[PDB]
């Protein structure tokens, strides 16, 4: 079949129209800018309800309250600033390995290896939490929820397909399907028209959510990843695997922008998180200890070692107070 | 400090009710089970009184046991293994009467072989159930064993062919100082693997507490 | 969602008396509970609190010694025993839920009640007027006054306006001075500083005339305002 050499030289074609566009990479150009400095961040609380590994955690727009979920069974919510427990939620299925927080604040979602995602409602007029719906559907493993409106929901599956759903109904408004391995990850656009996805095959997808079809790939990683974020002004997003490096990828150019790795490093990336100013890049590792980079001079500025176990989640609030790390350790804590 | 006391008490009843859930989950057995193609992992489950992730609830002399099969959902093992790392024990499942179909029993000491070198577990003990006993009786007196054993040499019959593989079982794991594997044969009829999954568990434990005491 | 009130009547003086609220639609044993009571001649009194769970009780002077309170989580079921009753105890009385979290909404729902005839350092909460006769399709303002300020230091003022219809039970209409209860029209606001607060309706409609009343949440006893009559 000629299929087989036309595919080949297709992606010869677009390889070549992507180094053309790279006549100078971010250095050399932010080489001039004085750096950042030293960052001393301290545990200023410490939210400890958990009995078992923490796997996932998500902010609240009001930069107030959070969310988290562990193997125990229960997700909880956690007022960041008392240290208080406003709900606790026991879900049915306790191989939890999601979580989501609702931008209007009225809802929360989860999802495990149940091959499940359920919508749990918050604000009753009965006074306590109860589900609300079960969107099911998917062959595999729920590995990442995110919330587009107070309706939608774009959910990530161990089944290679990513979903858009539509809670009123129940039933799967869109499906992309794109890659050949397990998709892990997932991270929304800051206006909620597009976002991308990354997966197993050490690749990620660019998935417009109206027409539901792949718009870019972007490669470069060795190995499965983990962890997606957009930057704050929406054009670019950072990625981290399991060969104990991260790398930023750009929208528009379509190719690969800046990477950090260390030789220290061997352990890989469990989560991503960006800052407000896009100055400085949060990733936590395998090494017990999360590190801040200076993402435009790729250069350690900080350490947040605090914790006994790997670092499985990370989050940075809206309005850029703090930073939310959680680990196995089943204890999560907020930098400032 | 006016109506926060209020929230602060809600704080603490809802910490109370975690710290007895949990108390309540730590005294409970959890056990992972793990099979092959037809390989009898739904055999076992008949005797006990019994999506992706299947979770069976049951009792025994007053020990409550969960199993945990994982054999509906297919995906990337390497992913989501970890989830039950500290379990109980793993209990694994292999049919006695596949030595000759198909190159069945080389897959499934790949599998065993895969299962037990797992750097999650490490220190993770193994029951075995053999399975289609009555079956295998017959099926080798009128077929050599050597068809999936060409290195073999032995006499074709019921008694020491059974030694033969359970014996070929134990040279697969390398940490052998570390964790323990228990061996057991049985058939459809003849319930009597609740004792012997009881047993070892009771061996588990208690080799755990001697650990956690500094000895051992 | 619903509280029925039980146990009123006629009470000879220095009697006793044992009042009864059942819930159902909601939570019990996830809401605190008040009992507040109104004369019949004058304003809303609080009365009494029991927390979740039966941690914290609290009284008001007039009652300490003499009103008690409790619950029955499995039965869903709230209790106030009364003894050595006197004429001022003559009134009408409220069960009322109230749940305390970052960012709930106490003293929403209010049950009808029952009455009770008997034969024969706090805060200061005053109303400037007592009765605005306005044609409807306006506006009106209503001002509450406080001997002491209600902004604690972490930020917030807990200031509390509700109303009154003719012949009901009160209802919640804005909590913590600046916030709007659920299943309430927009036209309704509030605003004010330390010590001086203001309640204005806007685009005035049919059943919006009643009583007006404002109650602080700074600290226990609750103490009520005046209230101001809006009628036509």
């Known amino acids: 079949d000629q299929l087989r050499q036309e595919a080949e030289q297709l992606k010869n074609q677009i390889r070549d129209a992507r180094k053309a566009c790279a006549d100078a990479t971010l250095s050399q150009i932010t080489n001039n800018i004085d750096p950042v400095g030293r960052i001393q961040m301290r545990t200023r609380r410490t939210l400890r309800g958990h009995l078992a590994k923490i796997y996932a955690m998500h902010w609240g727009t009001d930069s107030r309250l959070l969310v988290s979920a562990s193997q125990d069974g229960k997700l909880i919510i956690w007022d960041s600033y008392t240290t208080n427990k406003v709900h606790a939620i026991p879900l049915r299925s306790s191989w939890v390995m999601t979580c989501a927080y609702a931008p209007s604040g009225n809802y929360v979602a989860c999802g495990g290896l149940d091959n499940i995602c359920s919508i749990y409602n918050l604000k009753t007029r009965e006074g306590n939490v109860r589900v609300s719906r079960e969107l099911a559907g998917h062959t595999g493993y729920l590995s990442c929820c995110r919330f587009l409106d107070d309706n939608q929901i774009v959910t990530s599956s161990g089944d290679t397909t990513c979903a858009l759903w539509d809670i009123e109904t129940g039933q799967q408004t869109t499906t992309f399907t794109g890659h050949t391995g397990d998709v892990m990850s997932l991270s929304l656009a800051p206006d909620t028209r597009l976002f991308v996805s990354g997966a197993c095959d050490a690749s990620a997808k660019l998935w417009d959510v109206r027409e539901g079809m792949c718009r870019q790939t972007f490669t470069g990683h060795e190995s499965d990843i983990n962890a997606i974020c957009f930057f704050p002004n929406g054009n670019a997003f950072a990625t981290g695997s399991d060969d104990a490096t991260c790398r930023l990828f750009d929208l528009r150019a379509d190719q690969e922008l800046m990477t950090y790795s260390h030789d220290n490093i061997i352990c890989g990336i469990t989560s991503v998180s960006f800052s407000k100013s896009g100055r400085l890049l949060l990733a936590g590792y395998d090494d017990f200890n999360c590190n801040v980079w200076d993402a435009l001079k790729a250069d350690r500025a900080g350490v947040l070692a605090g914790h006994d176990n790997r670092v499985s989640c990370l989050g940075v609030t809206d309005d850029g107070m703090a930073v939310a790390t959680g680990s196995w350790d089943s204890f999560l804590k907020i930098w400032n | 400090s006016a109506e926060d006391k209020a929230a602060v008490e809600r704080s603490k009843m809802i910490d109370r009710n975690l710290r007895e859930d949990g108390e309540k989950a730590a005294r409970e057995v959890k056990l992972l089970l793990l099979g092959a193609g037809e390989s009898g992992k739904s055999t076992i489950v008949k005797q006990m009184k019994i999506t992706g992730i299947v979770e069976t609830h049951f009792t025994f002399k007053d020990l409550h046991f969960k199993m945990f099969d994982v054999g509906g959902q297919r995906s990337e093992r390497k992913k989501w293994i970890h989830c039950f790392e500290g379990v109980t024990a793993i209990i694994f499942c292999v049919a006695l009467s596949d030595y000759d179909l198909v190159n069945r029993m080389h897959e499934s000491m790949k599998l065993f072989d895969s299962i037990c070198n797992n750097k999650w577990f490490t220190d993770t003990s193994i029951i075995l159930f053999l399975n289609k006993k009555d079956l295998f009786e017959e099926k080798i007196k009128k077929s050599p064993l050597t068809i999936c054993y060409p290195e073999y040499a032995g006499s074709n019959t019921y008694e020491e062919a059974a030694a033969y593989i359970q014996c070929q079982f134990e040279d697969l794991n390398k940490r052998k100082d570390t964790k323990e594997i228990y061996t057991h044969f049985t058939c459809a009829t003849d319930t009597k693997n609740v004792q012997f999954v009881f047993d070892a568990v009771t061996d588990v434990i208690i080799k755990n507490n001697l650990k956690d005491c500094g000895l051992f | 969602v619903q509280l029925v009130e039980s146990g009123g009547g006629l009470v000879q003086p220095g009697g006793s008396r044992k009042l009864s609220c059942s819930a159902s639609?909601?939570?019990?044993?996830?809401?605190?509970m008040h009992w507040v009571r109104q004369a019949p001649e004058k304003g809303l009194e609080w009365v009494a609190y029991?927390?979740?769970?039966?941690?914290?009780?609290y009284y008001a002077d007039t009652v300490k010694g003499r009103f008690t309170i409790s619950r029955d989580d499995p039965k869903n079921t709230l209790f106030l025993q009364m003894t050595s009753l006197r004429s001022e105890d003559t009134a009408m009385y409220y069960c009322?839920?109230?749940?305390?979290?970052?960012?709930?909404?106490?003293?929403?729902?209010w049950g009808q009640g029952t009455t009770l005839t008997v034969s024969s350092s706090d805060i200061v909460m005053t109303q400037a007027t007592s009765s605005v006769p306005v044609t409807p399709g306006e506006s009106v303002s209503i001002s509450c006054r406080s001997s002491?300020?209600?902004?604690?230091?972490?930020?917030?003022?807990?200031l509390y306006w509700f109303l009154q219809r003719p012949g009901q039970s009160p209802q919640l209409l804005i909590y913590?001075?600046?916030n709007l209860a659920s299943g309430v029209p927009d036209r309704f606001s509030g605003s004010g500083s330390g010590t001086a607060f203001t309640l204005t309706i806007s685009r005035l409609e049919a059943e919006d005339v009643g009583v007006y009343y404002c109650?602080?949440?700074?600290?226990?006893?609750?103490?009520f305002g005046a209230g101001t009559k809006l009628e036509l």
């Open positions: 009322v839920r109230s749940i305390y979290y970052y960012g709930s909404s106490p003293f929403d729902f």
């Open positions: 109650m602080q949440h700074l600290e226990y006893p609750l103490t």
């Open positions: 639609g909601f939570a019990f044993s996830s809401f605190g």
């Open positions: 002491k300020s209600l902004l604690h230091s972490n930020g917030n003022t807990y």
């Open positions: 913590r001075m600046s």
């Open positions: 029991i927390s979740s769970g039966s941690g914290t009780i």
